[PDB]
């Protein structure tokens, strides 16, 4: 629904609060 | 077999393809003697005293029975003057 | 540019690392603080900034360098590194 | 504050090494004394501290970096190194 | 020009061949050769966008059959000012 | 034979620590009855956890494009049997 | 004692564990740690021949399951004087 | 001369054999031995084009069966002036 | 020790290289002139001497180091070294 | 460092192995060896709590397969002053 | 006889211990530094010497005493004891 840089690289980033 | 001294390298860009990639050296029995050219099967520097084989043995010494050589260096003499 | 969040991207080869650095610094307000040759082909580029900026930057960088050369190894964020870790972090490229 | 025990984490690449070092120094009272580029992609981070602190730190660091990049190679604790081994151990990171 | 062309190779000989082909094919400046580690070598050129397109294509075509070959061929048309700090200026 | 065959046996410690040759008498080996100084008395002291290649040798079989041919005529030392030599642009030399 | 014992490992952590086990197991002196390249690390000890034998066996046992493990374990009882020029003297 | 010949090998022993064969084959100057990283070694020679051609052919033949072998044998007869900035002038 | 012949042994890892150097210098009258860390794990040891001495030394070293560690890569003899190559050969370890 | 670690064995040889392993494994001080009677032997170490934990674990691992083996491996993190009268020193 | 290694043999009863000590001292150049009556019938014999000598000696003693009397309990070698363990080791037999 909300577009921008936050929609990129899903499943590739590992420092995020969701990952932790 | 003859004993010859390596004088320098010999380069022939347009030589026949059957010579392969082998290097060639200018050799003579002594400084001032007639120059000859040998296939260097060993890897020799100028001033080395080497052992050269001719005739049909030079062909196999240079890599194959059909190699186009009649003079091949087959060894460096350990101590000579 | 202020903020102490750290963003890191590790690639195989230098070309994906440079592409990642370009994309990161274009995407958000982050500072490129270092490029490190790890050895064995690994290259790591590091950015600092605010937490949201670093999140956006690392996402853009990982997206950009994924299919470049031998590709991406890691894309990681640390919102606040311990003061001890600062000693092993470069300050300028 | 440093100590007698030694904690070591080896990773493939630098990003898991930095994550491990951050987790280690946050988890317990340990001092980061070295980040070594071993060669071939191996990176090792070394910490010193009291024995329980080093134990906790190494466990946290091993958990933190295992899914980061190319991951963890080894997590190791030596409660008291022989005095000769001290000569091949860094005192401060470079 | 400010466009950037990059070629990554396995080994140094294909990198030198790529640099030679790149600089012969178009009006680009060779700004660096980097030993990455693990055998990777990267050569970087700068120039106009069209020149860099031509140069990178020629370098990739020339170096792919040399040695262990070609890893990447990449163009950054507009380089951010931050990235200039990690790019070499002269070889 | 006094010494175990070289192919079959691999020594735990090479050099002067080899055990492939059967030495009788009062040598420095230790049998099953003896304990200490090795085995679990060396590997069981320090806790350890186990986690889960780019080189010239590893690249020796990397996929390559088709080898260039040579179509030139005239005597030019145009050998095709030896090592692959390349000229500018990847042309066959 | 002037015998020489060597252990080679993949990575530094098994090398450090091997050095610790070697110096604890027998009467030897740690004389060097060398980064060979490509991940190889070598640790070297000196001492009496039997002591070096015991130390190297203990070190190989200790570092075997640590990290990427053990590569080599070797003893030279009488080092030629030429070889001393490539051996480190202090760690 | 201004031609350039390079030979890349896996390991240093084939590189030294290649350099020796190259310099024994023709009048070329050894200008560099580069440890590329990861085990690659490159040796570079300069000279007249025919000399460099002969040297590189001989060197590639010599080092093919030595050690872990040959990676590349390349000749550049006319070197662009830009490339000279990344080429060593004397061995280190 | 005189003579300009050159013997080289390349190994995977340093331990077989040191064993090879020891065997070479014990077997014949040769001078150990260098130990080079090539990169990627390759190690090369170089000796100088007379052709017969270097021949014997390289044979002994190749025999000795083949079962040590990750083993032997190359064992090579050059009877006469071109003066150009002397610039890339170490003179002392 | 006033924690106390104790290892009790059947026979002297596992006791000496345990003492060696304990002192090598962590920063502890060996304070005594006691012949209890009937074959029991006890070795005692002092130090910081975490160091004592490491040392006692290592000693128990080392001595359990030596001779007639291991009887007890115990840690007292803080020793009452009364008990110090029955503990050996140095 | 100078030596840092320690060799120990524990037996049930005194006769196997004496046989072990005799075999050990005949086999290699080791010093007999202790014969300890442990209690409950255990007897321990301790030797010191160079590492290879102690290995040979302890092997010989363990072979010799295993079928004598009530037999052998333990045969153990420590190539170098910690400096603190030296305080609980006898220096000469009593
Ligand atoms: Mg982009």
Author numbering:
A (entry chain X): 706 to 725
B (entry chain 4): 1 to 81
C (entry chain A), I (entry chain D): 4 to 96
D (entry chain B), K (entry chain J): 4 to 97
E (entry chain C), G (entry chain F): 6 to 96
F (entry chain Z): 773 to 824, 829 to 869
H (entry chain E): 6 to 97
J (entry chain H): 6 to 95
What do the authors of the reporting publication say about this deposited model?
CsoS1A and CsoS1C differ by only two amino acids (3rd and 97th amino acids). The cryo-EM structure at 1.8-Å resolution showed that the resulting T = 9 shell resembles the T = 9 mini-shell formed by CsoS1A. Therefore, we speculate that CsoS1A and CsoS1C share similar features and can be naturally interchangeable during shell assembly. We confirmed that, similar to CsoS1A, CsoS1C can form a hexamer alone, while when coexpressed with CsoS1B, CsoS1C can form CsoS1C/B heterohexamers. Mini-shells (~25 nm, T = 3) can be formed in the presence of a single type of hexamer (CsoS1A or CsoS1C) and pentamer (CsoS4A).
Among diverse BMCs, carboxysomes are specific CO2-fixing BMCs found in all cyanobacteria and many proteobacteria. The carboxysome uses a polyhedral protein shell to encapsulate the key CO2 fixation enzymes, ribulose-1,5-bisphosphate carboxylase/oxygenase (Rubisco) and carbonic anhydrase (CA). Carboxysome shells are typically composed of three groups of structural components that form hexamers, pentamers, and trimers. Here, we generated recombinant α-carboxysome shells of Halothiobacillus neapolitanus by expressing all the shell proteins (involving three CsoS1 hexameric proteins and two CsoS4 pentameric proteins), together with the C-terminal domain of CsoS2 (CsoS2-C) that mediates shell assembly.
